[PDB]
Structure 1
Amino acid sequence: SYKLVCYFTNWSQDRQEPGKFTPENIDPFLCSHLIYSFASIENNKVIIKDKSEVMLYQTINSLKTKNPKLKILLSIGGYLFGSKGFHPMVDSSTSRLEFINSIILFLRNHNFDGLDVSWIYPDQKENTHFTVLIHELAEAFQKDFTKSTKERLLLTVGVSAGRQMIDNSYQVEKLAKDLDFINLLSFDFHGSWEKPLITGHNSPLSKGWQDRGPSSYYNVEYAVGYWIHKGMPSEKVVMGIPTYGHSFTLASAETTVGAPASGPGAAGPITESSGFLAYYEICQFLKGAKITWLQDQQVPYAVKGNQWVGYDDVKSMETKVQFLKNLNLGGAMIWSIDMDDFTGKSCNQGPYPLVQAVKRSLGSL
């Protein structure tokens, strides 16, 4: 039994085609779990800020009628929300209790199966707050189940794949008791924010030939091994796989991993954010590009003109699924299905080429 946990986002609705996504684009049988990104916190209570909020509820109810086994979770956190978003809610047990009670009511009222807490990232400063918040949610969800005729609300967390951040942020053995599973954020290993500013892959499975010492932690295999080492049962690790890539503008003629970059890559036409591209943008980028498969890191990168893009393709999906099966992981998580070529129109490999390849690979005996 493997999970396929699929994040989708509430900002993809604002994009033009072929990136214009709403919950109606969701195939109810594509994933085992869907996670809505992201809720907000107002007056210490959970809400959803989304012009299409009430239509989301319609889709939730429709999806769960079509596939009664489907679980749909609500996520709070994400990069933009940061640590600031969790204040003032986390500042006392009183304000945290307001929040936890709001969560139970909201999830039940709106037919959600659970909560994902994706705090990006606690670090030293918020380690205690994150830990207590998770512990209090877990306890409250259990108490609520003790009294309910309904299923216990699930509790998951999106967590760092970086060793140092993991060490600083988490009390892993406690997290292993409190969480149903972790959504391991095994991507954003490299990108245009790095100093020195050199090319590197978003989500390498394995270490680079040039990696030594601390740089040898910056890959998926290491991250998964580290979480397990720290006490997370392998079956509670749901390994994140990205459907976006990180891009660089090259500073010289050199086009290899670790070549100098002047900055992020050119923004994609649809996502309009220099430094990343959705898969449906990558399929356009690849026309006229030279693609290299890294034998050391087991992932591709492509170069065209002065642009360098490290991304994940169908070969990477099948490779990463074989790896997670070999390590007895709980499944795969996707960030995010609304950046796969969900329409099928860009890549000409049918709808959701990456996620279908994950599903097919997971299901293959």
Structure 2
Amino acid sequence: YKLVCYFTNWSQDRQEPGKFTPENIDPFLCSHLIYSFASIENNKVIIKDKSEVMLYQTINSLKTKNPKLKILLSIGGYLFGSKGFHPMVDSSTSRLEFINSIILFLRNHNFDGLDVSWIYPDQKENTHFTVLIHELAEAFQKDFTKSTKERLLLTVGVSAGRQMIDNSYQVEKLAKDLDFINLLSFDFHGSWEKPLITGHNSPLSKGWQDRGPSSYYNVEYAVGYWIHKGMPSEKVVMGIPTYGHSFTLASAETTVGAPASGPGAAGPITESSGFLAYYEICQFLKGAKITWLQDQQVPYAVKGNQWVGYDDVKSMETKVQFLKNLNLGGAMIWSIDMDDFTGKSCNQGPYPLVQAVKRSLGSL
């Protein structure tokens, strides 16, 4: 099994216990690490990060410590959107420039591959995304035929939502071109929804109130659908979140599907109404009531008018058992810098969530 771990370049600006740098990375924690995110300037790959050159130092230390560790570079993410890939994708000339810059950049800086996480192609960018991936795949393969080093890996963070999947992807082709997908099996529910009701960020299974299309909004369905569409199960690396989605409750009802007036109060460290990192969640749970959903196989917690749907150690072990049953490629984490990486907040040691995933994957 793979354990694929995204980390981010904005977590370094947080205060403790959320102040993360690549030096917080345990080189034996994960099989793959993925830096989030690179940029594109003048159709070439760059890293925009005040700490860029220190990142390279840590990459080299980590890979020296653990010769098996793979470290990939990611382009994309929600904020980058589709706009970020233009004008690079607009022509084969500009795409060739990009692809050539990637190979040189990854080799120069000791990266093992590229993750393309286009959020999201949809109908409009379906062709652009398909060709980009295919051209990258071929170039990497070409490079390999000429090289003494391993072939550069190619992966993609992909939607777990059935409609977005149908619109964005040509799955059989993707299966040939990608080494694996990083299934983004989270953000199923949240304070952007209308009607504005509580719902879990990342339920494993369908809710008792779900019927029809709402029956798609869970991890088991997403996984099954990708397989159905032609992605081999062992190329499905299943995303698990270390964050939760929060709601401010509109009434006294505290159940799933209860009315919400908006996102929950911002965490003190992440300062973004609507989500909480796990290290903030452990502080939230103090004085909260926690319910484990038997239908959906994940917890939520309520304190005052605040409702948080999140993933804990029980969820980690339950989702790992699931991915193993379905013969998936492994687990992916978004993101390790939102786990309690210092261990100072949750009283469960360093990376309590990710370590549980690791322990569960390694268990016979």
Please report how far the alpha carbon of residue 10 of structure 1 lies from its aligned counterpart in structure 2 after TM superposition.
0.0
Q: Which residue of 1 aligns with 2:135?
A: 136
1:203-228 deviation digits (Å, cap 9, x = unpaired)? 00000000000000000000000000
Please report how far the alpha carbon of residue 359 of structure 1 lies from its aligned counterpart in structure 2 after TM superposition.
0.1
Q: SS in structure 2 opposite 1:105?
A: helix
Q: SS in structure 2 opposite 1:128?
A: helix
Q: Distance in 2 between matches of 1:125 and 1:308?
A: 36
Q: SS in structure 2 opposite 1:108?
A: helix
Q: SS in structure 2 opposite 1:248?
A: strand
Q: SS in structure 1 opposite 2:138?
A: helix
Q: Distance in 2 between matches of 1:229 and 1:16?
A: 44
Please report how far the alpha carbon of residue 176 of structure 1 lies from its aligned counterpart in structure 2 after TM superposition.
0.1
Q: SS in structure 1 opposite 2:318?
A: helix
Please report how far the alpha carbon of residue 240 of structure 1 lies from its aligned counterpart in structure 2 after TM superposition.
0.1
Q: SS in structure 2 opposite 1:356?
A: helix
Q: Distance in 2 between matches of 1:12 and 1:77?
A: 17
1:113-168 deviation digits (Å, cap 9, x = unpaired)? 00000000000000000000000000000000000000000000000000000000
Q: Distance in 1 between matches of 2:159 and 2:195?
A: 22
Q: SS in structure 2 opposite 1:40?
A: strand
Structure 2 unaligned regions, length at least 5: none
Q: Distance in 1 between matches of 2:282 and 2:121?
A: 35
Please report how far the alpha carbon of residue 332 of structure 1 lies from its aligned counterpart in structure 2 after TM superposition.
0.1
Please report how far the alpha carbon of residue 364 of structure 1 lies from its aligned counterpart in structure 2 after TM superposition.
0.2
Q: Distance in 1 between matches of 2:311 and 2:346?
A: 13
> TM-score, normalized by length of structure 2?
1.00
Please report how far the alpha carbon of residue 43 of structure 1 lies from its aligned counterpart in structure 2 after TM superposition.
0.1
Q: SS in structure 1 opposite 2:62?
A: helix
Q: Distance in 2 between matches of 1:121 and 1:279?
A: 26
Please report how far the alpha carbon of residue 7 of structure 1 lies from its aligned counterpart in structure 2 after TM superposition.
0.1
Please report how far the alpha carbon of residue 94 of structure 1 lies from its aligned counterpart in structure 2 after TM superposition.
0.3
Q: Which residue of 1 aligns with 2:302?
A: 303
Please report how far the alpha carbon of residue 304 of structure 1 lies from its aligned counterpart in structure 2 after TM superposition.
0.1
Q: Distance in 1 between matches of 2:120 and 2:266?
A: 25
Structure 1 unaligned regions, length at least 5: none
Q: SS in structure 2 opposite 1:115?
A: strand
Please report how far the alpha carbon of residue 53 of structure 1 lies from its aligned counterpart in structure 2 after TM superposition.
0.1
1:315-356 deviation digits (Å, cap 9, x = unpaired)? 000000000000000000000000000000000000000000
Q: Distance in 1 between matches of 2:68 and 2:243?
A: 28
1:25-70 deviation digits (Å, cap 9, x = unpaired)? 0000000000000000000000000000000000000000000000
Q: Distance in 2 between matches of 1:264 and 1:174?
A: 38
Are 1:45 and 2:44 matched, yes or no? yes
Please report how far the alpha carbon of residue 279 of structure 1 lies from its aligned counterpart in structure 2 after TM superposition.
0.0
Runs of 4+ in 1 over 6 A off after TM superposition: none
1:266-289 deviation digits (Å, cap 9, x = unpaired)? 000000000000000000000000
Please report how far the alpha carbon of residue 169 of structure 1 lies from its aligned counterpart in structure 2 after TM superposition.
0.2
Please report how far the alpha carbon of residue 189 of structure 1 lies from its aligned counterpart in structure 2 after TM superposition.
0.1
> TM-score, normalized by length of structure 1?
1.00
Q: Distance in 1 between matches of 2:19 and 2:125?
A: 35
Identity %: 100
Please report how far the alpha carbon of residue 357 of structure 1 lies from its aligned counterpart in structure 2 after TM superposition.
0.1
RMSD value, Cα: 0.2
Q: Distance in 2 between matches of 1:150 and 1:325?
A: 31
1:179-212 deviation digits (Å, cap 9, x = unpaired)? 0000000000000000000000000000000000
1:67-105 deviation digits (Å, cap 9, x = unpaired)? 000000000000000000000000000000000000000
Q: Which residue of 1 aligns with 2:315?
A: 316
Q: SS in structure 2 opposite 1:18?
A: coil
Q: Distance in 2 between matches of 1:17 and 1:283?
A: 14
Q: Which residue of 2 aligns with 1:185?
A: 184
Q: Distance in 2 between matches of 1:132 and 1:205?
A: 32
Q: Distance in 2 between matches of 1:100 and 1:5?
A: 23
Are 1:10 and 2:6 matched, yes or no? no
Q: Distance in 2 between matches of 1:333 and 1:101?
A: 28
Q: Distance in 2 between matches of 1:125 and 1:9?
A: 28
1:253-303 deviation digits (Å, cap 9, x = unpaired)? 000000000000000000000000000000000000000000000000000
Q: Distance in 2 between matches of 1:74 and 1:23?
A: 13
Q: Distance in 2 between matches of 1:208 and 1:318?
A: 20
Please report how far the alpha carbon of residue 230 of structure 1 lies from its aligned counterpart in structure 2 after TM superposition.
0.1
